[PDB]
Amino acid sequence: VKESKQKIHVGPGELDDYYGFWSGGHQGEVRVLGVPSMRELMRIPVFNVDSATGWGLTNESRHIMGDSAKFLNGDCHHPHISMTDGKYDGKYLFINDKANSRVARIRLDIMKCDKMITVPNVQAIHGLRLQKVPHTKYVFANAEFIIPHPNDGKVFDLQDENSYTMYNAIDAETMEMAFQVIVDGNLDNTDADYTGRFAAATCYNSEKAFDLGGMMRNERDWVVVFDIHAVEAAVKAGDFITLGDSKTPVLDGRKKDGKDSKFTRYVPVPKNPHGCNTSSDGKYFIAAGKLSPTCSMIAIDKLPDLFAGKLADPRDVIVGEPELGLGPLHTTFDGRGNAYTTLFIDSQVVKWNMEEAVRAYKGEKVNYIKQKLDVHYQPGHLHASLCETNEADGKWLVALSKFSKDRFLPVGPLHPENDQLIDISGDEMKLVHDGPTFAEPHDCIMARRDQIKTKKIWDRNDPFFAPTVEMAKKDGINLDTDNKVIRDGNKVRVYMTSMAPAFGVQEFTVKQGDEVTVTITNIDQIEDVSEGFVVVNHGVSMEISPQQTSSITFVADKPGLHWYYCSWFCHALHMEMVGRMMVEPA
Amino acid sequence: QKIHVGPGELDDYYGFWSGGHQGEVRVLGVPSMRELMRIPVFNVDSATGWGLTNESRHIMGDSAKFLNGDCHHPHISMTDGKYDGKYLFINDKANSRVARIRLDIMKCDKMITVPNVQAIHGLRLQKVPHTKYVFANAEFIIPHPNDGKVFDLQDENSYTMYNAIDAETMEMAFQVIVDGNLDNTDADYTGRFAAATCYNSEKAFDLGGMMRNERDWVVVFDIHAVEAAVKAGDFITLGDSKTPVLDGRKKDGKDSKFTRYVPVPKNPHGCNTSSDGKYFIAAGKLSPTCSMIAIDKLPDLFAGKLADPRDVIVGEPELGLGPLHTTFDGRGNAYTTLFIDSQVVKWNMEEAVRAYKGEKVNYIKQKLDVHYQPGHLHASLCETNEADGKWLVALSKFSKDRFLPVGPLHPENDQLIDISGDEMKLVHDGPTFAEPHDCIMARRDQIKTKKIWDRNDPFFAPTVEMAKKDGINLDTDNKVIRDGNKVRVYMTSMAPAFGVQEFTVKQGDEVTVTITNIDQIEDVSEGFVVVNHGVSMEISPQQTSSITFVADKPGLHWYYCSWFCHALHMEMVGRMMVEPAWSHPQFE
Ligand code: CUZ
Ligand code: CUA
Ligand code: CUA
Ligand SMILES: [Ca+2]
Ligand SMILES: [Ca+2]
Ligand SMILES: [Cl-]
Ligand SMILES: [Cl-]
Ligand SMILES: [K+]
Ligand code: NA
Ligand code: NA
Ligand SMILES: [Zn+2]
Ligand SMILES: [Zn+2]
Known part of the structure; x- marks a missing residue:
């Protein structure tokens, strides 16, 4: 029994x-x-x-x-x-x-x-x-x-x-x-x-x-x-x-x-x-x-x-x-x-x-x-x-x-x-x-x-x-520290650290039609402080958790000012964790 | 409470x-x-x-x-x-x-x-x-x-x-x-x-x-x-x-x-x-x-x-x-x-x-x-x-x-x-x-x-109006409509059988598959997946659904019903046969 x-x-x-x-x-x-x-x-x-x-x-x-x-x-x-x-x-x-x-x-x-x-x-x-x-x-x-x-x-x-x-x-x-x-x-x-x-x-x-x-x-x-x-x-x-x-x-x-x-x-x-x-x-x-x-x-x-x-x-x-x-x-x-x-x-x-x-x-x-x-x-x-x-x-x-x-x-x-x-x-x-x-x-x-x-x-x-770390190495980038924009023909490789409540790169300028790669390293050491990255009206969205590096590629096909923002509520100042991509026309 | x-x-x-x-x-x-x-x-x-x-x-x-x-x-x-x-x-x-x-x-x-x-x-x-x-x-x-x-x-x-x-x-x-x-x-x-x-x-x-x-x-x-x-x-x-x-x-x-x-x-x-x-x-x-x-x-x-x-x-x-x-x-x-x-x-x-x-x-x-x-x-x-x-x-x-x-x-x-x-x-x-x-x-x-x-x-309703231009009654028809390099498959389905279980196209054809689930009983949802073509959708009772994809691969390609619907769900399948480009007129 x-x-x-x-x-x-x-x-x-x-x-x-x-x-x-x-x-x-x-x-x-x-x-x-x-x-x-x-x-x-x-x-x-x-x-x-x-x-x-x-x-x-x-x-x-x-x-x-x-x-x-x-x-x-x-x-x-x-x-x-x-x-x-x-x-x-x-x-x-x-x-x-x-x-x-x-x-x-x-x-x-x-x-x-x-x-x-x-x-x-x-x-x-x-x-x-x-x-x-x-x-x-x-x-x-x-x-x-x-x-x-x-x-x-x-x-x-x-x-x-x-x-x-x-x-x-x-x-x-x-x-x-x-x-x-x-x-x-x-x-x-x-x-x-x-x-x-x-x-x-x-x-x-x-x-x-x-x-x-x-x-x-x-x-x-x-x-x-x-x-x-x-x-x-x-x-x-x-x-x-x-x-x-x-x-x-x-x-x-x-x-x-x-x-x-x-x-x-x-x-x-x-x-x-x-x-x-x-x-x-x-x-x-x-x-x-x-x-x-x-x-x-x-x-x-x-x-x-x-x-x-x-x-x-x-x-x-x-x-x-x-x-x-x-x-x-x-x-x-x-x-x-x-x-x-x-x-x-x-x-x-x-x-x-x-x-x-x-x-x-x-x-x-x-x-x-x-x-x-x-x-x-x-x-x-x-x-x-x-x-x-x-x-x-x-x-x-x-x-x-x-x-x-x-x-x-x-x-x-x-x-x-x-x-x-x-x-x-x-x-x-x-x-x-x-x-x-x-x-x-x-x-x-x-x-x-x-x-x-x-x-x-x-x-x-x-x-x-690791393959993203390797890309960074070819560009001479230290992902833990660097906030840099690399220009290569019509290709733009943005590298930034991020830590609530600020992106390490808060603006950058490109030419209409450029192919933009954004690479983000979350250098927080606090568990559960996930960050996000969204480019408005460009179909771009990703997670970056603590000590992670994430990257995403898209083409800047629209001239003008285009906001990006952190999608993951990370801080009391989360709403204000934003940046600007400026796209010059021909 | x-x-x-x-x-x-x-x-x-x-x-x-x-x-x-x-x-x-x-x-x-x-x-x-x-x-x-x-x-x-x-x-x-x-x-x-x-x-x-x-x-x-x-x-x-x-x-x-x-x-x-x-x-x-x-x-x-x-x-x-x-x-x-x-x-x-x-x-x-x-x-x-x-x-x-x-x-x-x-x-x-x-x-x-x-x-x-x-x-x-x-x-x-x-x-x-x-x-x-x-x-x-x-x-x-x-x-x-x-x-x-x-x-x-x-x-x-x-x-x-x-x-x-x-x-x-x-x-x-x-x-x-x-x-x-x-x-x-x-x-x-x-x-x-x-x-x-x-x-x-x-x-x-x-x-x-x-x-x-x-x-x-x-x-x-x-x-x-x-x-x-x-x-x-x-x-x-x-x-x-x-x-x-x-x-x-x-x-x-x-x-x-x-x-x-x-x-x-x-x-x-x-x-x-x-x-x-x-x-x-x-x-x-x-x-x-x-x-x-x-x-x-x-x-x-x-x-x-x-x-x-x-x-x-x-x-x-x-x-x-x-x-x-x-x-x-x-x-x-x-x-x-x-x-x-x-x-x-x-x-x-x-x-x-x-x-x-x-x-x-x-x-x-x-x-x-x-x-x-x-x-x-x-x-x-x-x-x-x-x-x-x-x-x-x-x-x-x-x-x-x-x-x-x-x-x-x-x-x-x-x-x-x-x-x-x-x-x-x-x-x-x-x-x-x-x-x-x-x-x-x-x-x-x-x-x-x-x-x-x-x-x-x-x-x-847009899909119903497309079907009408082809002379299709969605509630009954199981037909393959051909129109140049476009193929429009219309089928009814009711567990455990697709109403069109095979059809043949030329390599490169743009295929639209339209399925009308003519079951009456609640909760018999059906599905449709074309293997290795990135195609998947639901069809619930009395719904019509459609999906368009390119038959870019020659040979036989299975499709199957994804939503468990029947004891014979495993066997509700069909075959798309794609004739190779080299056997049809050549375009650049
Ligand atoms: Cu976007 S904010 Cu307090 Cu509503 Cu969650
Ligand atoms: Cu960083 Cu929200
Ligand atoms: Cu029809 Cu599973
Ligand atoms: Ca204010
Ligand atoms: Ca058997
Ligand atoms: Cl509110
Ligand atoms: Cl088993
Ligand atoms: K969270
Ligand atoms: Na692999
Ligand atoms: Na609308
Ligand atoms: Zn199983
Ligand atoms: Zn099983």
Whole structure:
């Protein structure tokens, strides 16, 4: 006997116990929440353009974004935190972009996106998860959509021998591609084991069909299992091809005339399986059945025998297939031996015992279902605290439901997502809070307060603006002290320190048509004194926090006097923290 | 008064938060302080496609080229001094705009770039007899014309202007040249008078100069005189704008017909009309006071019956260090933020007036510590004659240690305070992003929203008229219209299928995709994303939305529905096939 009775109220002056990192959904950012209050503490821009901080306008952010800075949109789903020895290490958060086929890395000490990659030769990065052991060496990313190779407009047939999609491994630390594995069918979600050897992905379109009926044709799709060690061996030996103009090593993980690749095994699993979730004890890849009212449990410790050819049938690694309810989509873990699965149709979370399910699969009459909790309504992902680690603590569960209906005040034709906080600390799940959220966050991840360590003020050597420091060095500028205007043809490079309540350069004059770069270094040492910079009627806006250098470039296409001002309330004299750009005509 | 909204309970109020430097408007439930919706305005929203779609770019006009805004001041339209729930208006200081949000669909439906001005900051609405005008301050003095021949703020043609916009048409109604500059503004409860604070009577550009004068002022506008002069045709126009411009400057110590200047210390900031209609209350900021302007002494002021403009001041209570903003409980108490002392001070307005006449009396009732450095504050219904004295939100600029560390950039702290009693009680710390400066609350029953669009809605009526030139019935048609190097795809959609699931174009073609969501059920929002083309938008029930992009890449390119709509959402996809340029006629 043990009751679910955790406190959910965080009053004024008290602090949350966990960080929550929510996907921004179709809006493209990442959001930091406090748990259990469920309040949003910060927004981290990634694929969106943020007016407030200038992400997508500043030179530092556009440098990180590369050519994809031309896109103003992203579509996020799956946020994950880097691990060492199967425990969160607080270093990085990674997230997908389904719309423009990217992966982004967030540095959790500064809470900013610091690296971004467009995955080559694929369309739509959706499923995403991290290697656990011995650390997050790879980020594993699913490209969802089958395309021709090359995709040059000669062939559109998705059944062509060179039409396929690929599993993607990105080097977590350099954020360069590591390798890609061609697969049969398509990819939905993915997860990794607790050794570094195996990873797995559900596939819903084993039919390689383009119509909805054609995609639900097979009684069984599969989860494809990857022998990452075998892939690495082939890469070290130079046994790969490359595609197009990408140097990324490409391995062929498809079945050929019924013959298995060395890199993959295809395990039959019903049906359009969706979630692919690794239990915190490291025993199982659990695939949610979706169109089948089941989950399929793959025994990770049978995978070595599978790849060695010691098992008679790939179905032999399946050790449980519990029947749970209608529309199972995703699974999470309390660390006590239970799994928690969302039932999209029944609109519930079902708590079930994994080892009891395994015994039932063998024929024992044992009820593995512990409880079903109604949620409101149509849940997709769910997430228990530390569930992706061997420290899963069984304290909090968030279920992310797609249809909020009447759970909040009406706000027009568009509705919020309902992210419901559930106490799982005791024997009985208890619903404690309804959290409305914008643009369908879809999935989220939690970390203990003591697993995250952030900077109070920037380091002057920070790589985030190192390229700007280098520019300054070429101009002979000391960013910590200088207030100078550099003239170079029709290019003007203004450098200034800023400290509330005065810009270090309070006026400058240019010629109509000049290309103006303004570089600002906030030389305050006081935490929380953020500064801003806005050029009126020129589309220019950015943040400069303490000890940060930020820069932005725009053309002075309008003659006359044009004001700039500090946007971040920084001082009692904030309204008066302003300057003048004077633009001479021809 | 219940503080917590449990699962299945609803909030009692809507809150409309300024999005600050991030540029949107946010809808919260009060008292839970949870965000229920985001309404894109000056930001580009990946999720709904605002700033990408043809409908939204049509509304933004030429300013669709800007990806930023800087919001401060949301206000709800009124009839006879009470909110009527029709419209929300908000400022853009960064690119000099005013936007209107329709509160039935919770979208921005109109936007205007205010001509011949820089930086729209202060904004407020006429109260009586209804919101005929939106009043908006341009903060910064500029040359006229601003053609780069003259830069001097002291020149006789350097000035800023007060701006009145027609609330219903969202066209300019008039502009009034002022001395000094303009910070915040409010309006009376008759329709005759509006008022604005000024902090730069010195017309300087450096920090020292802007603080030189012991007093600046609040400028008072006689709107009846302005309208009369417009009907009489006694006005000029500036540049290409047809907006009537009236001159409200002093000339050689003689007042204009349109304005009076009441000296107020010092770099005053907030300008707030008491809910009983009695006072314009100016927050003294660099002066540890507020200045109370007796609205019923204004007619005499404008008729020469008073010797000194200061004679309309009937109170000037000493409150504390750095007064910025004032609000009202409807019980005769005012509440003022003290930025430096980091408090909310509750004070009785009638007793402050008594003390100004020398009657020794302590008008200060309570000082509540807030965390930290508060800017604006808002009490529920404070802008109307129904000010109900229930909730107060103070919007503080430095949250410091009140929330978990999230790196060098901190959230703002918007603190909900219970004022239903004699003692202010702090009940909730609400962190927010990008500095909402201000917010406005409305009772649940003051807001009525639509769940399904009407097919004739003006938001996409331009799109309906485009479709008709192509012979298209948007409610039924799934057609690919070709027109040179332009391709216009029209489709219905209803979960989980697009009505056009594939189409073929030539490389370089300009493709417009128009989708009409013909579902009838509430909350089946659909989406549309073209992979690797920077294309994303929302289509809600009965809405038509459209988006235009160049098919610049040969090959097969998937599109998919982004908004979860169905159990078969994952499979609601389509294919754009782009034939390569080398297989079609070659152009340079
Ligand atoms: Cu722009 S100021 Cu006190 Cu309104 Cu926040
Ligand atoms: Cu510097 Cu506000
Ligand atoms: Cu239609 Cu998702
Ligand atoms: Ca299938
Ligand atoms: Ca002054
Ligand atoms: Cl998953
Ligand atoms: Cl104000
Ligand atoms: K702040
Ligand atoms: Na990169
Ligand atoms: Na307009
Ligand atoms: Zn997902
Ligand atoms: Zn899912």
